Amino acid sequence: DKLYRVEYAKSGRASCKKCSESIPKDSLRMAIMVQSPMFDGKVPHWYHFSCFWKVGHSIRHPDVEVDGFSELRWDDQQKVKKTAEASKKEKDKDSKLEKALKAQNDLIWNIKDELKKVCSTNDLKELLIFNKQQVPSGESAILDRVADGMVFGALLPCEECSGQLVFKSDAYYCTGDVTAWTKCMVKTQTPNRKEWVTPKEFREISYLKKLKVKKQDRIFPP
Amino acid sequence: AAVDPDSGLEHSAHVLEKGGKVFSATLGLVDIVKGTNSYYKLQLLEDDKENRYWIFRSWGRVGTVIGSNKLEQMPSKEDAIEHFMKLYEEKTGNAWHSKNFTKYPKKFYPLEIDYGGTKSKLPKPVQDLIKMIFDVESMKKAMYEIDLQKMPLGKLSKRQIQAAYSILSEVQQAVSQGSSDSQILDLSNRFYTLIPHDFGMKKPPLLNNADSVQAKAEMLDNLLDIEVAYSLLRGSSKDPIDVNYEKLKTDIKVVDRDSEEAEIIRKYVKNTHATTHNAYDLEVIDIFKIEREGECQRYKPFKQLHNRRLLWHGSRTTNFAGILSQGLRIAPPEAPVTGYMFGKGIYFADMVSKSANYCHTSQGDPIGLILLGEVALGNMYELKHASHISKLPKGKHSVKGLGKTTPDPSANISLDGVDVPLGTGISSGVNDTSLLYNEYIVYDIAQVNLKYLLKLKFNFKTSLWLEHHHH
DNA sequence: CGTCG
DNA sequence: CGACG
Ligand SMILES: [Zn+2]
Ligand SMILES: [Zn+2]
After folding, report:
1. Contact A25, A41 (CB under 8 A)
2. How far is CA B85 from CA A147, B21, B114, in A?
3. After which residues does chain A break, using C–N > 2.5 Å?
4. Can you tell me the distance from the alpha carbon of B265 to that of B422, in angstroms, rounded to the nearest whole number?
5. Assigned architecture for domain B244-469
6. Is residue B315 marked as binding?
7. Which nucleotides of D are covered by protein (CB under 7 A)?
8. Which residues bind Zn(2+) 3 (chain A)?
9. How many whole angstroms separate alpha carbon A205 and alpha carbon A108?
10. Are A124 and A144 contacting, i.e. CB atoms less than 8 angstroms apart?
11. CATH 1.20.142.10 domain position(s) in chain B
């Protein structure tokens, strides 16, 4: 969708287009999406977070110009935002909402870390199945969606195509096929969902979540 | 079929055949949302001599250089066929043979490319006319040309062209029916798959603009007519000229140049032509009295009708073969509209300028053909603006669109009890009308009776005309 | 498969 | 689209 991309390296295998050295796994990396000459599709050109600013890319605003920014850890978002550079009720409520955002971010991340600590990939797949959720490709996305469901609830299927929705940077986009020819394009910040249900098998580890369900609701960018 | 030259083996080898099935596939994949417009070409090549076999893949974006290819030599023919079929099934989700193909999401769609005595005694004008309408060199050129802007991936079988035709009719039905935007997107994706377009690297647009849709429908109908003409050419001791004459099922005669009916025809042509929207003049060459087989019978119900008039019709010369074979025909109900303003029916004009503009003659072929028809109009339903009608009002036999210019009615002429509007172009007192020249329309094929057919040179006003006219 | 180009 | 862990 965007031009720039930022994420934690899903594999320690991509070579930086600047220093031509292996980018390690789970490390912060930034790509520029460039058209490919080999096939009809864009491809990410990956750089170490350091190398990326030495190529003179003048990113004005990361939160908007970079896809996947809204999904990084908080301190890493702050780092990317700083490096991209080198009225009472209004401002007061502004600061308070910022703190709430940090809360939700660090929350989801602690959840994902606990999960990866105790569960296996197949355990997470089973958690998704039990809650009537589609199992995506890639361990990262698997536990991302497990956390989404546990925080806000088992997403209910799409109203039209009947496919699962997934959270994107700005909204819950549907990922289903309205037909073999064209894909569905529903989006909404308020998707219907039933309550998340951990199978009883994982109860011993669900106390390893200490409940703490909370009544949170997804906070979306302005 | 053709060996893709990106393999460098079109002369060293040839595409392989087996079980009455060819091993060359051309698949398209489109998503207007993401903008993807991709092509995948797969071939199995066999050396013209030995048991040497190759698998050739190529892929990329239509009408661009984005993409790549790969050539593998296979150790045997069986391994090559397995490789081919498994690649096909990977890229399309279906098997290599199947009566019922089913589109699968994110998968490519297959495209149906189409590859590949002398004792006459007729008069010479008629022989030249037959040589004109049954011309094979021009037909084969127009059939299997190489225009990578209209056909970026080769000639399309008539089946797929009619499929896209019906898809466009459905698009128009939708736009009418307060449609879902997604109902339009599905048809847009399907169309742009069935008909590859060179859009460089821009996202293909939606079929919302109904005018461009009318245009694409006109293009597809032209291709269909050309396919029909080619299939008609492929119909001994008799001379080929008589052989092709017999296909017409029409009796042809040559009116004498110095005849009287001929001079009346010439006065018609001269008066009713207008150099205002036509950058050329008309010159008659040969007149032809035509009598179609059986058409003389189906018109009898209307010969006792009133207000029968002798009017013009003009189409490209390629179709004229068919036009004498099966008379004038109306469009089907499932076809879309291509620009006509008054529904599907037989159209005529009262001024040779208008009907001749529909010959689409070129400066390279100043010749064109044009028909004269006794059409039984009866009661005229007269309209000033477009109207896709279905039922004639109770009591009407035909429709007339009123332009701002018309032959002088005071100059009318009666030939065999048939009015002829050969007057000069004057202004009609019709206010607030959109047409420039009149249009006549009937909706029953039997209301037309072809009487004459003209060969005409379109003398264009180029440097040659400019010298001959300024000296 | 799930990465990467 | 292929290539590769
Ligand atoms: Zn680097
Ligand atoms: Zn949907």
Report:
1. no
2. 42, 12, 21
3. 86
4. 9
5. Alpha-Beta Complex (3.90)
6. yes
7. 1-3, 5
8. 158, 161, 174, 184
9. 17
10. no
11. 124-243
